[PDB]
A paper describes a structure:
Microbes are protected from the cytoplasmic accumulation of environmental fluoride ion (F-) by export of the toxic anion via fluoride channels known as Flucs. These small, homodimeric ion channels are remarkable proteins in two regards: first, their unusual ‘dual-topology’ architecture, in which the two subunits of the homodimer are arranged antiparallel with respect to each other, yielding a double-barreled pair of pores related by twofold symmetry; second, the Flucs stand out among anion channels for their extreme substrate selectivity. In contrast to most characterized families of anion channels, which tend to be non-selective among anions and sometimes poorly discriminate against cations, the Flucs are arguably the most selective ion channels known, with >10,000-fold selectivity against the biologically abundant chloride. The protein possesses two deep, aqueous vestibules with an electropositive character due to an absolutely conserved arginine sidechain and a deeply buried sodium ion at the center of the protein.
In order to probe the role of the anion-coordinating sidechains in more detail, we mutated Fluc-Ec2’s bromide-coordinating Ser81 to alanine, threonine, or cysteine, and also constructed a S81A/T82A double mutant. The S81C and S81T phenotypes were more extreme: for both mutants, fluoride efflux from liposomes was completely abolished. In contrast, the structure of S81C provides a possible explanation for the lack of fluoride transport observed in the liposome flux assays. An anomalous density is present in the vestibule, but has moved ~2 Å farther up into the aqueous vestibule, relative to the Br- position in the WT protein. We posit that the electropositive environment of the vestibule perturbs the cysteine pKa such that it is deprotonated at the pH of these experiments (pH 9 in the crystal structure and pH 7.5 in the liposome flux experiments). The pKa prediction software PropKa reinforces this possibility, calculating an approximate pKa value of 6 for S81C in the crystal structure of this mutant. To test this idea explicitly, we monitored currents mediated by Ec2 S81C in planar lipid bilayers as a function of changing pH. Whereas fluoride currents were near zero at pH 7.4, currents increased dramatically when the pH was decreased to 5.5. The increase in F- currents was fully reversible with pH, and WT activity was not altered by changing pH over this range. Moreover, conversion of a serine from this anion-binding site to a cysteine introduces a strong pH-dependence to the fluoride channel activity, demonstrating that this position comprises part of the permeation pathway.
Residue numbers in the entry:
A (entry chain D), B (entry chain C): 1 to 96
C (entry chain A): 2 to 126
D (entry chain B): 1 to 125
Write the structure that this text describes.
Amino acid sequence: SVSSVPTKLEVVAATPTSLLISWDAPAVTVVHYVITYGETGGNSPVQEFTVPGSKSTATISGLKPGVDYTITVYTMYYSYSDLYSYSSPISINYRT
Amino acid sequence: SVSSVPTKLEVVAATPTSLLISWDAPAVTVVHYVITYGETGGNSPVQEFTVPGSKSTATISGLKPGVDYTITVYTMYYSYSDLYSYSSPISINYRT
Amino acid sequence: IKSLFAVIIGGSVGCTLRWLLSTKFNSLFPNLPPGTLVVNLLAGLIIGTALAYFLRQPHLDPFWKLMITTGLAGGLSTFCTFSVEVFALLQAGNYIWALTSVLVHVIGSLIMTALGFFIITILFA
Amino acid sequence: MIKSLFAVIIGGSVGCTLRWLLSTKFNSLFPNLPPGTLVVNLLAGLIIGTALAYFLRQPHLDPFWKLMITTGLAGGLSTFCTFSVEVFALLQAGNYIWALTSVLVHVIGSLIMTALGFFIITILF
Ligand SMILES: CCCCCCCCCCO[C@@H]1O[C@H](CO)[C@@H](O[C@H]2O[C@H](CO)[C@@H](O)[C@H](O)[C@H]2O)[C@H](O)[C@H]1O
Ligand SMILES: CCCCCCCCCCO[C@@H]1O[C@H](CO)[C@@H](O[C@H]2O[C@H](CO)[C@@H](O)[C@H](O)[C@H]2O)[C@H](O)[C@H]1O
Ligand SMILES: CCCCCCCCCCO[C@@H]1O[C@H](CO)[C@@H](O[C@H]2O[C@H](CO)[C@@H](O)[C@H](O)[C@H]2O)[C@H](O)[C@H]1O
Ligand SMILES: [Br-]
Ligand SMILES: [Br-]
Ligand SMILES: [F-]
Ligand SMILES: [F-]
Ligand code: NA
């Protein structure tokens, strides 16, 4: 019954072409996090990358100035009932 | 179908009052051997003592010279089917 | 055939307990799931008591020795669940709890086996 | 919780019976490290390893099969108590070199079979 979704996803520092996002680890054994980002207006490819389960911050680079981006983070975690599985994502919007 | 009883029990050395016995260890994890010895003639009290499973020899002291003794040895071994149990004995006769 | 029923009746109660205990408790401490640990500590205890008690009752029906050890304690304990937890910690870069989970399980189960053995050993003496 | 209970019982019984059959046939062949108990742990590690990577790619499987294979089969197949008495019996027999070697082979071997099963299926997919 423990949630495997991260909490408090947020941009903690920003430049016009890069973002420093952070989140709170869920109460499960997170093998690694997956960070997705793309332009909110669904006319741009979505990119994904992983960070180790020990890190709870990530940097997104190569962005465009003054553009709305949808940033999501989900976990690839271990639990007893489900072994490895992907969690539902926590998502935020942010405008560079 | 693996025997826990020792084999080739024999007196390898002897004094008028002592006997050095030896045996071949059975192919089971023996925790300790139980060495019993008593006067073969009728109703003398049989005496026993243990020997660690790593040893395959044992000394028997305090005997009477020129007396027939019955010497038996069995194991307290671990097997998968019986956990800790005792094996059947192997016995020899000897006269000091 | 009768020996087969001992493993099935004993193993089912052991697996049922392990399932109930793991789903109810494993999530409370994911760095070392306490449900997988208890069933192993509890199985080491049962196997330790059984080790000493059965030695002094050589005429017990093997049916009961088989149901408690191979069945109950066998199905109660788990080595695979203990492995994925350690494997997942190693995959999560959580090396300090992968090692800690290995020691606590191994050292603990052996200690629980010795306690079960020596408690019955002392009671009879 | 009743249909989930049948998954643990059926998988565990098959797993407990397999551990019983394999142990009485092969453990006596090499007592310093009974190969039957080792195989059922390596095999359960392999099963839980393949399930780790296969369940990850099949997120819509009935929790009934996931329960029957992991908590049932692999759980009931592997044992931590039988691996404990063997180590506990070697320690009481002063056979420390095999008591230590048994602890390493089981723990590391079970994680390798978990990794092998996880990476064979990760590479196939
Ligand atoms: C983390 C804790 C680690 C340490 C655990 C305890 C180890 C030391 C135990 C000391 O007490 C032992 O008790 C044994 C009985 O339980 C005795 O065995 C005697 O009797 C046994 C049979 O009961 C035989 O198998 C033995 O060979 C024979 O020495 C033995 O002499 C005695 O020293
Ligand atoms: C006692 C021996 C038992 C048998 C052997 C068990 C081996 C288990 C771990 C193997 O799996 C790998 O572990 C790496 C280390 O955790 C992970 O690195 C991941 O996490 C690291 C964290 O520092 C990052 O640096 C890497 O880039 C990233 O791929 C990697 O993904 C994962 O596949
Ligand atoms: C790191 C995790 C630890 C977890 C707990 C481990 C508990 C270990 C229990 C060991 O049991 C003792 O082992 C001694 C050694 O095998 C035996 O001594 C017996 O065997 C010795 C070795 O042959 C002889 O020297 C002794 O005289 C003889 O009493 C002794 O009887 C036995 O009770
Ligand atoms: Br057992
Ligand atoms: Br499992
Ligand atoms: F395993
Ligand atoms: F155990
Ligand atoms: Na089990």
